[PDB]
From a paper:
The first insight came from a crystal structure of a dodecameric human CaMKII-α hub, for which the crystallization construct contained an additional 22 residues from an uncleaved expression tag. The tag contains an N-terminal hexahistidine sequence, followed by a PreScission protease cleavage site (GSSHHHHHHSSGLEVLFQGPHM). To our surprise, we found well-resolved electron density corresponding to the expression tag at two out of the twelve intersubunit interfaces. There was partial density for the tag at four more intersubunit interfaces. The tag binds the hub almost precisely as we had predicted the CaM-binding element would, and it extends the central β-sheet of the hub domain by forming an additional parallel strand. This docking allows the C-terminal end of the tag to connect to the N-terminal end of the first α-helix in the hub domain proper.
Residue numbers in the entry:
A (entry chain E), L (entry chain E): 343 to 402, 409 to 473
B (entry chain F), K (entry chain F): 344 to 401, 408 to 472
C (entry chain B), J (entry chain B): 344 to 403, 407 to 473
D (entry chain D), I (entry chain D): 331 to 333, 344 to 402, 409 to 473
E (entry chain C), F (entry chain C): 331 to 334, 343 to 404, 407 to 472
G (entry chain A), H (entry chain A): 329 to 472
Write the structure that this text describes.
């Protein structure tokens, strides 16, 4: 039964909104202080904390599409969502371009709130 | 620290099950509805183990795990992320090395840790 | 032969809507649950018209000419048809040089309320 | 292979099709295809091929595991349907290494005399 | 442009030179008269496809050719006469031009024209171009 | 090989199919009869040059074609009739073959043949090929 | 201009204090590089310091004039934001007056255009204390 | 398997003896690598030795098992001739129990075919004396 | 420019030729060339060009320092000669950087009515 | 026209000697002090026949066909002539695949003791 | 060691004469029949200074000389070989570095060192 | 006057013969113990002594051509020769190949014999 699946989609959407608005404070509230991240911008390295994503919230016409979302409920305090993210944007040439990414978010419940404890993206920035 | 070497233990049994080509144990370690992102999937999300079966039918290699980080989420779920370096030989026999970024998501159901979803980057 | 001329008409109207960037006429000729395989989708299957709106707004006054080569129409009753054709596009790049691009296209038409609509389409070749 | 009542019929005849191709059975493949079947595929090099004469070369001249991802089905009456899906193929090259390939496929089925047959199909990606 | 019974051969050379001059001047009006309405065409601008009509070349007459210094050179022309009303000429076209801020450039193409006299007037029924 | 007044059009189709079959079988004898001794040719094997005669294609009849499974497919044929004694056909040739240890391969070319009836027999006076 | 680290695995051990000293002078070095401060960098470097780096094209440069070019031209001009991350620092202590740190340096920066780019460089810094102050006698960089 | 050097510019200075010691143990290290002698290489290396090299793909490997693969498979099999040259060695002495050598390593070898090939690698070796014996605590290689 | 009695005549008319090309003087260049002069050069794209009509495009449409290296001269009577040499050209691109180019040149001179003229020339390398 | 046929004869004999690898006949038709620009010389001018002997011995029983396209002959008296032509070579590679190569060639003939000999030649294009 | 810094001195006056674009001094430092191998010569041997003139007509750069080796041959001839690294800026202004392998051949005629031939590799 | 030019050509030819025969002893006699060499096999590094060339004398159908030789006589004890060396050879494919090099030899007279004190080659092995 999808009791909390919508509950996961809610905080996921709030995450997307915090990224879109460039609001780093809301992103800090939704992430564990010791959050780890694999991503193409990490160049294959395991980077910990929000110190790495900060550089993007302080320096950043697009359209985002989420394809094939899968949610794994792991009890009453752990969840994990994986999906394909397709981003349509305009390059410096003003030409339409599209980029695909495969994203995995690991959510943990602490004190009645979902927080990202690990993030894994591949393979487009 | 204590329940971290259990995640490490089932992870080592997982990697060893992959290196020995033991599909029988791998199936036991994976949930039937396990999802996976990996280069072999060509950007698509593959569910189950029917996709991973083909890679068990198919000499000396050496695996080195670097910077393992473990996130504990309660008492029935965890997630381990690490860098996997692999030294091997290519037909002509020259030593080669490949890097991978792996994330395993473990969950305890019926008193047994199992992979529910895993994410790989690189090779 | 008369039944295929209708499909030719609605197809040419579709390509005219894409060429002129008329997204409203495009939405009228497309089913709300339309699926599409296209090079801009990066091998993924996308559903709905929300994915093409981005190309209607941003990408679309440079002269462009479109040519339809060797259409083939399969009639499947009085309410369903399929058309496959080669689409050539002569355009100008940033340097003003004349250029040309080929694209293989498949359109799956379904007559609903006496009005043909695309339920699925498949484009290949260069975008 | 790997992956509400009528959709499973299209899925069934489609799986029978893919297995008829994997085994090299041109007989059952010919029975499941219309004689005027049209095709877009990388083997046709951007051209539109008609009939089954182009596909015979492969059954005659040509360890594989096929996987189907996210099948979508469009029903257009009780005699016309259209299925689109992702086709992953795990195989071995002459070098012996396992390779994987992706191809987006679109099949257009039409019921004629109580039997579904392919009238047109469109594949992109893996040649 | 530079070029290079026999009377008839020369006639074909005449209508061909007028064709090249019409293309160079961007005069689609004269280009239409020398071409059959159902003219067949193979050219690299068609990307391996067969093009019928004059709608396809109109895009190049309108845009590009309507104009920096350009010199054409015809090399090794061969003419096949096939009766009073049919002929075929094949030759090598070399074009010297300038790109952006020249930098003088040169390009080669191999061209075949199939001429047919209809109602006392030579018209192209089909032509073939390579490497352009 | 698969292909695909009107009687005359079909006649051209006949001699053309016989040409393709003669090339496929490596039968230079029959290929010589259907070609004019002074046949003109543009083809990628000539590297942008114009080739006259049948000496040039003989190297391909002797060496290569004298033989793994190969299937030809003719797409979008167009025929221009230019009087009783002249005709021209243009089409797309697609060849399915095998390289070394196939690995089935496919290749496209755009071909133009210029036929001329001399003494009650169609002969090629010139032909043009692209992308092969 | 700032920098982060990953010191949880390194600090655990016998000699926390000296490890912290070497990380301190290392972060002061990287801070002097990020700000183009050639004065502080000169104070933290031995006069006879040797260097291996991609800018040397496989050669062993000695002194500070080779790096002075980059301090004067490239790093002095930087007004764009640059963020440095020190991943997985390992410290080898070799007596009271010598140490050696190795780490992965990840640089987040803005290119010519306004596009964020990331660069990785494996760095080895060899520290030697003379006159009661740690100084670099040799360093080795890989990657660009 | 042999190796040459260029020690005329390095030996001139105050501490000839210790410089010669470090060059000696360095040439013994390279000699153990050229012969695939994992025993001698193990004796000359600290157990907690760290490493940066192109084989590590920008990662910091620790221990000796990563190099053991190359000793067992690649370097044990070598029956072909290999000649190593140590160009421009620079030595930094950091107390009685620590030293650091940097040099250009040029390898003349025979490839798969019988064609002579040359490889360059910039090498930094960090030596620390424990139990009266010099050992590598860290090294850094560039180039292939 | 830069670099036993008759050879200096060929060298003299050759230097006058190269300077006539560098200044863009098509008049003196035409006087020094035979009307039926043939040419191999990279600008001809592997073809053999006849006359001076092909070279006019350059005098009309087109900081250079030319150097001649190792000139060899073959005398074949008192009315025919052939000189071969290396031609280095130091110039500046639109980027402003000094560039250097090499071209091997062969000139075939023939004395007609008491004046040497080029009947044929062959250049390789720099286009 | 008769005077040019002799040059055609000696030129065809030269190409026959190169094709059959007959180095002695090649030395008879070449002046001892012959100069050559050729792609095998890497932009350098080589003198004598010692440089071509290497190609006669080592490189030269695979079927090869040579075609001479558009020859042009300049007569410069009764003892000196020049011929320029395009040379096509159809051959087989290591894989047995038919291949073709173009080459622009210039031959400078000089009649000595009633026998034409090459004093200089210039080849370009692929070797 | 003493007559090595004279070769170094005339070499430094040479390099400085090149950096300042002073053809006048360069001509004095070179024999009129000086031969040269260099990438700008495209593998050919250029004699004299007419070829080097063009490179004097044509902002901050930094030159570093590495591993200079001097061979003394008597009392009127010497030869110095060295590696020349050059840091510069490319139009867009990114710092760049180039390596060169240079060999200068000095000879004392009329009481003055002069280059008779020089050989360069790389940039 | 070319008094010693032929005298330089003699020892140059003897050098070429020592290389062709693989005789490393004769090459040692004709080279100064502290000979320096720039060459493509040195990868831009200045290598000293005959220790580097040894590897080639102990591990090695061709034809060599010398073009445009220039000799610089620098007194009665120093000379310097520069020339272009073109080598025709057969590759592993059995295909004729050709390679160009630009060579500079610096000869010094000591005890009545010419010896190579410096060598510079570019840019083919």
């Amino acid at each position: 039964h999808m009791v909390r699946k919508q509950e996961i989609i809610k905080v996921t959407e709030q995450l997307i909104e915090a990224i879109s608005n460039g609001d780093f404070e809301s992103y800090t509230k939704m992430c564990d202080p010791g959050m780890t991240a694999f991503e193409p911008e990490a160049l294959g390295n395991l980077v910990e904390g929000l110190d790495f994503h900060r550089f993007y919230f302080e320096n950043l016409p697009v359209h985002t599409t989420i394809l094939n979302p899968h949610i794994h409920l792991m009890g009453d305090e752990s969840a994990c969502i994986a999906y394909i993210r397709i981003t349509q944007y305009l390059d410096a040439g003003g030409i339409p371009r599209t980029a695909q990414s495969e994203e995995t978010r690991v959510w943990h419940r602490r004190d009645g709130k979902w927080q990202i404890v690990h993030f894994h993206r591949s393979g487009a920035p």
